[PDB]
Design an enzyme around this catalytic site. Structure first.
Site: not given
Lengths: 187, 187
Positions: B105, B125
């Site tokens: 992420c 992400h």
């Protein structure tokens, strides 16, 4: 007005099945209370993650009612929920007021223990099917998430996002659920 | 001999991205240490789940080395990892010994901060791409999980199972990863 969720956390709960719904519900702007079955103290989950509840169940009950009561799985956690007179009372009251009840993995077996939602279509983890179906009080489903009115069930760690998003859709609507979903990077 | 994983847990970490890898790695028979960046005390995650670490990072470092060092995301957690001299030292040492480093992420942005793994293909992400790519030190990928040798990255909460299973495959092999996967009820 913000919707409210009670997540009942017992020793041996599946921590993924606890954290995914709590987090996703909070992303949806739901006021979530993580309530410790045993009290205020930290809870040792099935794979030894230790989570500190927001409140004891005893205290959290006093601040209800809730728009959803959520039961994580984990076999030992579900058994602890199944054995609790406090959980029985919370679920009966929720059912009586026509409030949503959501349970995942082994979690739905606590519905059986407390005689909640008989006559509903339900799913569970595949390994919990026989337990759930003892007596034939529910109709079994292999859908990843099953919703039969106010009884919402799901299968396992890997369906936890779908489960959580179903809860969000039920409470806050399809649009909110879609807005919450996109940043998760689900397949 | 069991493989060992260090999961570095900082305030503001994404709790799903922490718990999913810890749980799945433990299912794989990996000895996982959840190490608190700030010390031994409980850690308040991005969506307010509170997790009690197994050990401080200071103590956990003394029990290494580890077969994988895992960096959860959450923007504020990743920034805390990025700012830590202790994390810098752990990651440099891991890189130096040719050990796996895994980050999800916003987590990979700590690799950038600590100058780890330059020249690797990475993902993050989508919202962390520009941060990660400042300077052009990595080549960006939109794969849900990216593995370029000893640098293993992934995108978000919804890729956490894939991320964890990639770690399991890297450490314990494809067969173990498949055996762990089946009971999760992934799609």
């Amino acid at each position: 007005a913000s919707k409210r969720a009670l997540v009942i956390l017992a020793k041996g709960a599946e921590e993924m099945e606890t954290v995914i719904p709590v987090d996703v519900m909070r992303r949806a702007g739901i006021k979530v209370t993580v309530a410790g079955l045993a009290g205020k103290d930290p809870v040792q989950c099935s794979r030894d993650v230790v989570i500190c509840p927001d409140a004891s169940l005893e205290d959290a009950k006093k601040e209800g009612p809730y728009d959803v009561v959520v039961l994580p799985g984990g076999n030992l956690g579900a058994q602890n929920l199944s054995e609790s007179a406090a959980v029985k009372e919370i679920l009966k009251e929720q059912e009586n007021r026509k409030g949503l009840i959501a349970a995942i993995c082994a979690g739905p077996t606590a519905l059986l223990a407390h005689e909640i939602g008989f006559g509903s279509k339900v799913t569970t983890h595949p390994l919990a099917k026989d337990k759930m179906m003892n007596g034939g009080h529910y109709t079994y489903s292999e859908n990843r998430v099953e919703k039969d009115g106010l009884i919402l069930t799901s299968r396992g760690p890997g369906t936890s996002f779908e489960f959580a998003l179903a809860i969000v859709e039920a409470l806050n609507g399809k649009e909110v659920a879609a807005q919450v979903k996109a940043p998760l990077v689900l397949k």
